[PDB]
Amino acid sequence: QVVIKVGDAILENNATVDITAFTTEDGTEEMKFKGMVINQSATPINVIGKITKQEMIGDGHFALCFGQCMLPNVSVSPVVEVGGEGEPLSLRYTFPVSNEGHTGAFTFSCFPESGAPGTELATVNINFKYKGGG
C-alpha cells in the first residue's frame, strides 16, 4: 500500500533508479534523486524514511529530505504521516569534481513508525552514475 513514485511512474518495490545528471559549483558536483512516497490506503500511516546503505567516494556527502531536510549524512528522517497525495522525497549527493567517473549508491526504505528490522514498506535503490559511473 506504500509506494515510491519517480516522475510519472510508480516504482516496483526494490526498483533501481539511475541518476546521471550533475550540476557544478565551486569545484563540487551535486546529483539529486527526487520522488514521492505515497500511501494508497484510505487510512493515513506514520512512517520513517531511512538511508539503509550508503556508498560514496571519499569526501562525498548526502542530504536526505523527507518531511524535513536533514543535516549532511543524517540517515533517518522524522516521523511523517503519509496519505494518497504523497510526501516529497529527495536525496542529494555532493562530491568533488573529478575527471574520472564513479557510482555513489544508496538504498532508501520507508518503515512503519516502529523502525523494526524487516518491516520495510517500500524500498528504492538509487545509483548516482557520475561521468559514466566508473
Author numbering: 28 to 161
Please quote the paper that reports this structure.
PorA is translocated to the cell surface without the T9SS translocation machinery and localized on the cell surface in both A-LPS bound diffuse form and 23-kDa CTD-containing form, and thus PorA is a novel type of T9SS CTD-containing protein. PorA is 246 amino acids in length and is composed of an N-terminal domain and CTD with an N-terminal signal sequence consisting of 27 residues. We found in this study that PorA impacts the PorXY-SigP signaling pathway that regulates expression of the T9SS in P. gingivalis. PorA is the first T9SS CTD-containing protein involved in gene regulation of the T9SS component proteins.
Initially, we tried to determine the structure of the 23-kDa CTD-containing PorA, but no crystal was obtained. Therefore, we determined the core region of PorA by limited proteolysis of purified PorA with trypsin. The 23-kDa CTD-containing PorA was digested into a fragment composed of Q28 to R171, and the C-terminal 75 residues, which corresponds to CTD, were degraded into small peptides. Thus, we purified and crystallized the trypsin-resistant fragment, termed PorA-N. The structure of PorA-N was determined at 1.3 Å resolution. The C-terminal 10 residues were invisible in the electron density map, and therefore, residues Q28-G161 were modeled. The crystal belongs to the space group C2 and contains a single PorA-N molecule in an asymmetric unit. The structure of PorA-N adopts an immunoglobulin-like fold composed of 10 β-strands. The structure of the N-terminal domain resembles the ligand binding domain of FimH. FimH is a tip protein of Type 1 pilus and binds to mannose. This structural similarity suggests that PorA-N may bind an unknown molecule.
